[PDB]
RNA sequence: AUUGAAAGUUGUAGUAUGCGGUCCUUGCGGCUGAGAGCACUUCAGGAGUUGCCCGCGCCAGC
């Protein structure tokens, strides 16, 4: 069981809820966005039989894959090691799907980024081949984007360090089932990429007072029987 | 190539046009840098010293 442990350092991002007008940023990075980010270095980096002729069915067909050799679902989860804070823009970006308007119709549109300086998200892989887990290493970089084209995000390191078994508290995000086991965000994000399913994960970021704005700040759940480590520091992570 | 795909909160706009920090005003009037004062008093340009000693206006001239 080699899992993948990528950091990602970013200004802003701008993956939403569903929700008209207003699109309320995520607090933390959906599972189905984290996947697909490295489902597009899966199509681009070895396209001899991951890519076809629909970028849908390719993006699918990949999908599919590093779903099958994910341990759960549920895998993928992020880290708030530093603090989030949420910011709304007003721009042009203009409506023009919904029925009537035309093309030539553009009115204010309000759009919410968080901003966090970086982020550890770590994928859960089980038992893949060393030919494949070569490719699936370069795949961890070149993480271009997350959601929205404007959310910038450069991998400055990734890596396969295994957990070796710690106890540590929890950091990085876990699915509302082993955290009700044993300052409560519980949010729902969608575990699959929706193409033409629900599922319910706790939020490890908690308010603080401590200025104006309320910003996000860290809970540290319950002892876990399974950690991970990164430069000498634990860290808590959960595998079903 | 992922709550995803395309998406200027934008185009025109003098914080300007006029306005003596100005007019009158002796740094002026009176005032000895003045009064008393020997650059004086005593002094030989003085003592001694030959303008010396020798010398034919000379011999022949009716």
Do not use: H
Not at 4 to 19: D, G, Q
Not at 48 to 54: N, T, W
Not at 66 to 75: H, T
């Amino acid at each position: 069981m080699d899992i993948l442990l990528v950091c990602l350092r970013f200004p802003f991002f701008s993956v939403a809820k569903r929700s008209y007008q207003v699109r309320t940023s995520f607090l933390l990075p959906p599972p189905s966005a984290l996947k697909g980010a490295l489902a597009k270095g899966l199509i681009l980096l070895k396209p001899e039989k991951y890519a076809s002729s629909s970028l849908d069915e390719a993006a699918l067909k990949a999908i599919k894959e590093i779903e099958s050799k994910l341990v759960d679902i549920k895998a993928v989860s992020v880290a708030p090691l530093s603090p989030l804070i949420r910011n709304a823009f007003l721009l042009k970006r203009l409506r023009n799907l919904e029925s009537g308007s035309n093309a030539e119709k553009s009115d204010a549109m309000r759009r919410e980024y968080t901003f966090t300086r970086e982020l550890l998200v770590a994928y859960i892989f089980k038992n893949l081949t060393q030919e494949e887990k070569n490719l699936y290493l370069k795949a961890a970089m070149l993480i271009d984007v997350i959601g929205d084209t404007e959310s910038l995000a450069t991998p400055v390191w990734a890596s396969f360090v295994k957990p070796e078994d710690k106890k540590a508290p929890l950091a990085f995000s876990a699915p509302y089932t082993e955290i009700y086991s044993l300052r409560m965000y519980i949010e729902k994000m969608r575990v699959s990429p929706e193409y033409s399913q629900e599922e319910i994960f706790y939020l490890p970021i908690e308010e603080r007072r401590y200025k104006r704005i309320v910003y996000y700040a860290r809970i540290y759940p319950p002892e876990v029987e399974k950690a991970l480590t990164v430069d000498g520091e634990v860290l808590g992570i959960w595998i079903p």
